Design a protein around this nucleic acid. Sequence first.
RNA 1: AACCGCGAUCUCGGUGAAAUUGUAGUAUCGGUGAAGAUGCCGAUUACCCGCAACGGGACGAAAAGACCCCGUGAACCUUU
RNA 2: UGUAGGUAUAAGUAACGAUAAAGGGGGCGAGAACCCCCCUCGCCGAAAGACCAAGGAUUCCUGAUCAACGCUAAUCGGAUCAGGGUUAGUCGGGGCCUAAGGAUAAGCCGAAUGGCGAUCCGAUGGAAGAACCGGUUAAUAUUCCGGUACUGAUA
RNA 3: ACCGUGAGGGAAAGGUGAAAAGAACCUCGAACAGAGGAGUGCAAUAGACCCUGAACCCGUCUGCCUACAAGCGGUAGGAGCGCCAGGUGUGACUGCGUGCCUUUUGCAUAAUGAACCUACGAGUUACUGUUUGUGGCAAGGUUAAUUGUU
RNA 4: UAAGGGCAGACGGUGGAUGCCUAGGCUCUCGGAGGCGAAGAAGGACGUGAUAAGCUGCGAAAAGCUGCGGGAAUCGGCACAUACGAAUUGAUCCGCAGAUAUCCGAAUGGGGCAACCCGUCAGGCCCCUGACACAUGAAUUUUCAUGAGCGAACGCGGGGAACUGAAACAUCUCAUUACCCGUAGGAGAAGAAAACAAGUGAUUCCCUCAGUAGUGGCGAGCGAACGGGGAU
Lengths: 56, 128, 90, 48, 102
Amino acid sequence: AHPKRRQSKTRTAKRRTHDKAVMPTLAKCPNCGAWHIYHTVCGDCGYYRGKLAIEK
Amino acid sequence: ARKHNSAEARKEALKQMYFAKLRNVPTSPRKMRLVADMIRGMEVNRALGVLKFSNKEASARVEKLLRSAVANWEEKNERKAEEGELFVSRICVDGASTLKRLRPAPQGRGYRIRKRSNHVTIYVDTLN
Amino acid sequence: GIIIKPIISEKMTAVTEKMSERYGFRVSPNANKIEIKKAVEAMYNVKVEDVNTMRYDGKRKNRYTKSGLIRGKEASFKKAIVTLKKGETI
Amino acid sequence: MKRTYQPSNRKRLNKHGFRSRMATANGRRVLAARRAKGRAKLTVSDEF
Amino acid sequence: SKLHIKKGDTVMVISGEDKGHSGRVLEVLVKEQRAIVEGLNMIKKHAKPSAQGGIISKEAPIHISNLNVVDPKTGKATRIGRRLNENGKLVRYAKKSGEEIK
RNA sequence: AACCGCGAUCUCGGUGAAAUUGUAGUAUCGGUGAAGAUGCCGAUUACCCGCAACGGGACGAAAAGACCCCGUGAACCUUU
RNA sequence: UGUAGGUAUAAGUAACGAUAAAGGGGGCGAGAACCCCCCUCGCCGAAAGACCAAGGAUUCCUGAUCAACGCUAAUCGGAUCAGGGUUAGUCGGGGCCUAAGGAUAAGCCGAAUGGCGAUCCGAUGGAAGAACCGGUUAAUAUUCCGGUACUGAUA
RNA sequence: ACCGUGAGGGAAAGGUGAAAAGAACCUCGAACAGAGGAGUGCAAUAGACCCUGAACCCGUCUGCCUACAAGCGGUAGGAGCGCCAGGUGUGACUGCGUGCCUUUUGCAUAAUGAACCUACGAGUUACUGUUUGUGGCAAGGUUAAUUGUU
RNA sequence: UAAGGGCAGACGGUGGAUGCCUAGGCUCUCGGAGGCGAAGAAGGACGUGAUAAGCUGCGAAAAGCUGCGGGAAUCGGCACAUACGAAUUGAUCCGCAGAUAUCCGAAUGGGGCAACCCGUCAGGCCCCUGACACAUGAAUUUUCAUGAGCGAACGCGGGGAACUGAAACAUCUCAUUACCCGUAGGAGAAGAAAACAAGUGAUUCCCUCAGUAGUGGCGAGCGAACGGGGAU
Ligand SMILES: [K+]
Ligand SMILES: [K+]
Ligand SMILES: [K+]
Ligand SMILES: [K+]
Ligand SMILES: [K+]
Ligand SMILES: [K+]
Ligand SMILES: [K+]
Ligand SMILES: [K+]
Ligand SMILES: [K+]
Ligand SMILES: [K+]
Ligand SMILES: [K+]
Ligand SMILES: [Mg+2]
Ligand SMILES: [Mg+2]
Ligand SMILES: [Mg+2]
Ligand SMILES: [Mg+2]
Ligand SMILES: [Mg+2]
Ligand SMILES: [Mg+2]
Ligand SMILES: [Mg+2]
Ligand SMILES: [Mg+2]
Ligand SMILES: [Mg+2]
Ligand SMILES: [Mg+2]
Ligand SMILES: [Mg+2]
Ligand SMILES: [Mg+2]
Ligand SMILES: [Mg+2]
Ligand SMILES: [Mg+2]
Ligand SMILES: [Mg+2]
Ligand SMILES: [Mg+2]
Ligand SMILES: [Mg+2]
Ligand SMILES: [Mg+2]
Ligand SMILES: [Mg+2]
Ligand SMILES: [Mg+2]
Ligand SMILES: [Mg+2]
Ligand SMILES: [Mg+2]
Ligand SMILES: [Mg+2]
Ligand SMILES: [Mg+2]
Ligand SMILES: [Mg+2]
Ligand SMILES: [Mg+2]
Ligand SMILES: [Mg+2]
Ligand SMILES: [Mg+2]
Ligand SMILES: [Mg+2]
Ligand SMILES: [Mg+2]
Ligand SMILES: [Mg+2]
Ligand SMILES: [Mg+2]
Ligand SMILES: [Mg+2]
Ligand SMILES: [Mg+2]
Ligand SMILES: [Mg+2]
Ligand SMILES: [Mg+2]
Ligand SMILES: [Mg+2]
Ligand SMILES: [Mg+2]
Ligand SMILES: [Mg+2]
Ligand code: NA
Ligand code: NA
Ligand code: NA
Ligand SMILES: [Zn+2]
């Protein structure tokens, strides 16, 4: 229930080894020329798989 | 005269460093360090895309900081950066001052709450 | 001189645009209706019909210094809505 | 759950007010001690 | 305490960056013992646009112990004393030449 | 005993405590020993770092044992 | 098991306070699960609706602000700053009267300080003279405006 | 201030610069939120929490080591690599090694005690005795209260 | 291969140690003074500024009014301010003397939950206002002076503990202390022998006599006076 000892800096950092921020899955627009999330509508131009989806 | 000479030397050194700073951001330094470690060393435009689409909250502020650092590079070089020419050469997150608050606990006890802040520094340089 | 200052506000403007024989003063908190009436007759040479009064305590305010904060108060006052006889203005 | 403090202004002024302190010799002793310490509030009659 | 200089006098700066320069006293700040001398100790103040702004050049006060009354005989920035020459009224006179200061 | 529903639980985004804490790169068995050993001896086993889950040990945490004795200590109660 | 201040560890862990419940479309905005408007859904309904009193004391309305506060964010707020807002002859209270009790007079008691002791004070009780229908503010209304009245003094 | 019905208890908190000259204007950004410049200034790593700016605690970079290894974490040996001319960083591998305080006949003890750092924290003074080191006078030694001149 | 980790150096962050500084304390010396108040105190409430007042000052004459003396160019208090004015015909400022001085408070016209409510009588205005008076006790003869309340220490007086020490405890001690109460003055108290002594000559204070004479479960402890030298 209670820690018998305080943890050292080394022990704490060893546990935190596996803490990381996930990289987003980014695809390039071959025509538009910008970044967007793969399998997601490109919000700059509204196109998805070569077809207009969201009309600005 | 000694302090004047030292200040002149430091000012001359500053002219060849391209950096921006964010100070006193009211947000956990340990949480900001995740994003910093994610984007350390990346090409600048790819890093801008990563920060734009990241699922962490701190990326919104880091994106503005990186844009400001790129603008400082452009001003100190008196030109514009070409595509794929700059990269994130240095980035660190430091702990800042903490706000202390009290939250009531059962049976009359009271506990301290720490609202932490952070500083971020970004350098940019050419892929040499 | 119990009368301190006239009341210029949206409510007073609306009531004067409606009735035109009604005027609002801010006076000392201890002056009753008879003395408010005699005072406005002296100060404006008009005949007064009726007086309505209400007491306001001062607002509590926060004076800000370099180090911290102090708690202060505004002065109390008395409102006096004054109805003149039909025919006269101020 | 009923707690110990149940406010009543009449009771407060009857128990701890300036006139009740001035009524007895020991109340005047309390007032003299508070004046000697220099308290900004002397009785519960001061608070508003 | 009455001062050794007054507004409308001509003084000389005996110490500081403006050492050896004479000017006219414009205003005296008695509480902090400083005076404004015309044309001396110029400062560039940055002012935001208010009642266009800009960079205004202005005069900054000088401590009065750095100012001495100019002798009206050679302009040598003497010391002064006080005497009762003018019909017994106290007046200021220069010590280097003995002439009164008017 | 089986199955079912929601809340807690688990994963992700935001905020973010506490008790505890000599330092720790903190394995097992037998022996030894202030006489029941993570830390000594001799062997045995064991690539580095997490997450979920359970409570055998750390004579685990908490409260300077209330039981027992002691102090020319204290209080209260009774009485020829 | 020493004191003050600062910073750690456990740990990005416990928890975010009733299992009445939410979905969508528009608006404003740099930024929206949460703010504003609309439609649909759900909960209370001898209440979780509407009033009087105690207690609180500007929290009420409006314009700016989102630093701190709000257990998330916030363009929102019972938050910050400024301005505004409470109107009575008839409503309530007090002015009048006494209860318990309290302070006292004449007197009594008592090292002192003081303790008793029938007129006064003292509501939680008694007396109170006396309307209304319609409008009207961002915020007050039996109080303001228009109609119908009543009640007490005074010449 | 805060706490308590009340009597009462009772904090924390000083320092820009000689002079506000307290940063016009530009850039990124919704915004000074913040920063990078420009300018002022001896100095802005003196920029409003502002002199100096330590430790615990938290980061980044560079050098060396580290994924077959087992106990107070050091100590004595000792290759290799790496820096600035005999110094310095790291350290493969080997030997030895159960913290410290207190309390006890005896504690690695599974007896007590401490999260850590900075700061604070415990044989003092007066009088009277007595012994002694060093001195002044010496069959004598010494003044107390107080009084004069300054 | 270093996912991570260890050590060192450099540079940062946080935090606010240290060094330097300060009129804010502490302890005293010398000289004064030793009270304020019914002609209304101490201490408060509410007001008062060109702009809200948090302090300061002042009181409806309200950061202020008048006279005399000093003095000579700025001034209009402070919390990093502008405006607008005053001032050599002498402002502001300093010394002395005056004027005004709301409400509560001994509070004193009666009440009351302090800073409020309600009155009477004489006038003056005009249901309501501003200005008078209206308490009680003691000398006193209804005319008159005096008192009440507050407040540092020092003085005198009336009551008066316990823990503690005696290695328990009761006589004793702590101690005629703490504390409560009453009451003066610049000091108070004492003071001019029905005295000490075995000759001195009123009180008071200092140095000695002296830890002596005594006293005491003769335990723990307590503890003089005569005489001598001084201040006066
Ligand atoms: K009316
Ligand atoms: K009214
Ligand atoms: K000088
Ligand atoms: K302990
Ligand atoms: K708004
Ligand atoms: K400096
Ligand atoms: K300095
Ligand atoms: K530092
Ligand atoms: K070793
Ligand atoms: K034990
Ligand atoms: K006497
Ligand atoms: Mg993890
Ligand atoms: Mg935060
Ligand atoms: Mg997100
Ligand atoms: Mg509670
Ligand atoms: Mg407010
Ligand atoms: Mg869990
Ligand atoms: Mg989470
Ligand atoms: Mg064994
Ligand atoms: Mg074992
Ligand atoms: Mg152990
Ligand atoms: Mg245990
Ligand atoms: Mg024990
Ligand atoms: Mg403990
Ligand atoms: Mg855990
Ligand atoms: Mg909980
Ligand atoms: Mg949970
Ligand atoms: Mg109320
Ligand atoms: Mg509201
Ligand atoms: Mg928030
Ligand atoms: Mg509001
Ligand atoms: Mg009666
Ligand atoms: Mg009643
Ligand atoms: Mg309403
Ligand atoms: Mg903002
Ligand atoms: Mg420096
Ligand atoms: Mg510094
Ligand atoms: Mg092997
Ligand atoms: Mg290996
Ligand atoms: Mg033993
Ligand atoms: Mg041993
Ligand atoms: Mg023990
Ligand atoms: Mg321990
Ligand atoms: Mg131990
Ligand atoms: Mg310690
Ligand atoms: Mg450092
Ligand atoms: Mg007058
Ligand atoms: Mg004069
Ligand atoms: Mg009376
Ligand atoms: Mg005893
Ligand atoms: Na469990
Ligand atoms: Na590493
Ligand atoms: Na009275
Ligand atoms: Zn595309």
